[PDB]
Structure 1
Amino acid sequence: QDLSEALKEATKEVHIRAENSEFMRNFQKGQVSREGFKLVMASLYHIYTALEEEIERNKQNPVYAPLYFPEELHRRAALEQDMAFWYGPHWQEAIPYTPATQHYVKRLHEVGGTHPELLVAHAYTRYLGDLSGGQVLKKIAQKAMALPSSGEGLAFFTFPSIDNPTKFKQLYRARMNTLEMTPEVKHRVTEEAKTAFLLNIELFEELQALLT
């Protein structure tokens, strides 16, 4: 069984749970505030910073390298633009770094530094969602918060180097399927993808509490 399929299958249940977190349920209904949106986007800034630091560390490592697509996929620059938009020019000392965000970052560094063969789980969980469902979330955000089609404040959700998210997704999955796989690696990769998803749920839980 192909890795791309094994991951989709292993995470379909937890994905249902993630969409139904209180924060995402409210987000999807069009009830996201600037305060709530700023918190989540600041937390992603930290998460994608860590993810992409570890990607760069492992770019030549054959357990990751076939997924090395910085120009197309990396979000850190986009998130910096969004931070300047939402938080102003002194955003680096305005933005929060919540405990659940720190916890996700920690696991990202553990994976990148000690278990790089699992980094694909984390890239899969974030980037493939951003290319799929994130495009729906973009539209809802834009409408909720009166964000302009010209894209300011939603750079995260915009992939100017990818013509067509569906075709790129199909390429990315094809390339995942070229990673050297043993039963050991495959089983732990799909476990770590479930952990990535839980880390996200835990963040959304935390943000919702901080908002109430």
Structure 2
Amino acid sequence: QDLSEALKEATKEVHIRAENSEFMRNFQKGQVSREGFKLVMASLYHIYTALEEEIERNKQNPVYAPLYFPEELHRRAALEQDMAFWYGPHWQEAIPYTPATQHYVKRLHEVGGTHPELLVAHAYTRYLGDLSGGQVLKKIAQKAMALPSSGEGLAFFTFPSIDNPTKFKQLYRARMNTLEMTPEVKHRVTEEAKTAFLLNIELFEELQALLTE
């Protein structure tokens, strides 16, 4: 079975559970507010920072290299623009770093530093979602919070180097299928993707509790 398919099948159940996290339900209904949005986006800033440090560490390693798309996909510089927008000029000392965000970042460095053959699972789980549900969430955010169509504060959701997310996702899947694949790597990559999804769910469960505490 192709890696792209194995991953879709392996993660289709937990995707359902992730898209119905309470935080995401509230978000999708349009009950997202500045405070909650700031929290989630600050947490993503740390997550993508760690993911992309690890992509850079492993960019020439053939277990990852065919998925190396910094110009199209990487989110850190976008997140920095967003953090300056939502948190101001001293955002770096303002932004929170939650325990569930730390947990995710920790696993990211373990994968990038020790199990780089699994790094694809983590790039898959975040980037392809950003090009899918992330586009729906962006429209909702804009409406709920009165964000301007010019993009300020939602640079994370904006991919100026990708003309067509659907066609890009297709390119990316096909490229995943060119990685060197053995049953051991395939098994473990799809397991790590389920883990990635759980790390995301845990983040959201946490952020939701913080907002109701």
TM-score band, normalised by shorter chain: over 0.9
What's the CA shift string for 1:139-159, capped at 9, x where partnerless?
Answer: 000000000000000000000
User: 1:74 & 1:20 partners in 2: Cα distance?
Assistant: 26
Q: What SS class does the counterpart of residue 153 from structure 2 fall into? A: coil
User: 1:137 & 1:209 partners in 2: Cα distance?
Assistant: 20
Q: How high is the TM-score relative to the length of structure 1?
A: 1.00
Q: Does 2:134 match 1:127? A: no
Report the counterpart of residue 20 of structure 2 in structure 1.
Answer: 20
Report the counterpart of residue 200 of structure 2 in structure 1.
Answer: 200
What's the CA shift string for 1:176-210, capped at 9, x where partnerless?
Answer: 00000000000000000000000000000000000
User: 2:40 & 2:15 partners in 1: Cα distance?
Assistant: 18
> How far off its partner does 1:135 sit?
0.3
Unaligned 5+ runs, structure 1: none
User: 1:11 & 1:147 partners in 2: Cα distance?
Assistant: 32
Q: What SS class does the counterpart of residue 153 from structure 1 fall into? A: coil
User: 2:67 & 2:52 partners in 1: Cα distance?
Assistant: 12
> How far off its partner does 1:211 sit?
0.2
> How far off its partner does 1:41 sit?
0.1
Report the counterpart of residue 183 of structure 1 in structure 2.
Answer: 183
Displaced runs of 4 or more, over 3 A: none
Corresponding residue pairs, total: 212
> How far off its partner does 1:86 sit?
0.1
Name the % identity.
100
What's the CA shift string for 1:45-84, capped at 9, x where partnerless?
Answer: 0000000000000000000000000000000000000000
Unaligned 5+ runs, structure 2: none
User: 1:207 & 1:43 partners in 2: Cα distance?
Assistant: 9
Q: What SS class does the counterpart of residue 62 from structure 1 fall into? A: coil
Report the counterpart of residue 38 of structure 2 in structure 1.
Answer: 38
What's the CA shift string for 1:92-130, capped at 9, x where partnerless?
Answer: 000000000000000000000000000000000000000
Query: Pairwise CA RMSD of aligned residues?
Result: 0.3
> How far off its partner does 1:89 sit?
0.3
User: 2:27 & 2:205 partners in 1: Cα distance?
Assistant: 13
User: 2:171 & 2:177 partners in 1: Cα distance?
Assistant: 10
User: 1:148 & 1:112 partners in 2: Cα distance?
Assistant: 36
Q: What SS class does the counterpart of residue 63 from structure 2 fall into? A: coil
> How far off its partner does 1:133 sit?
1.0
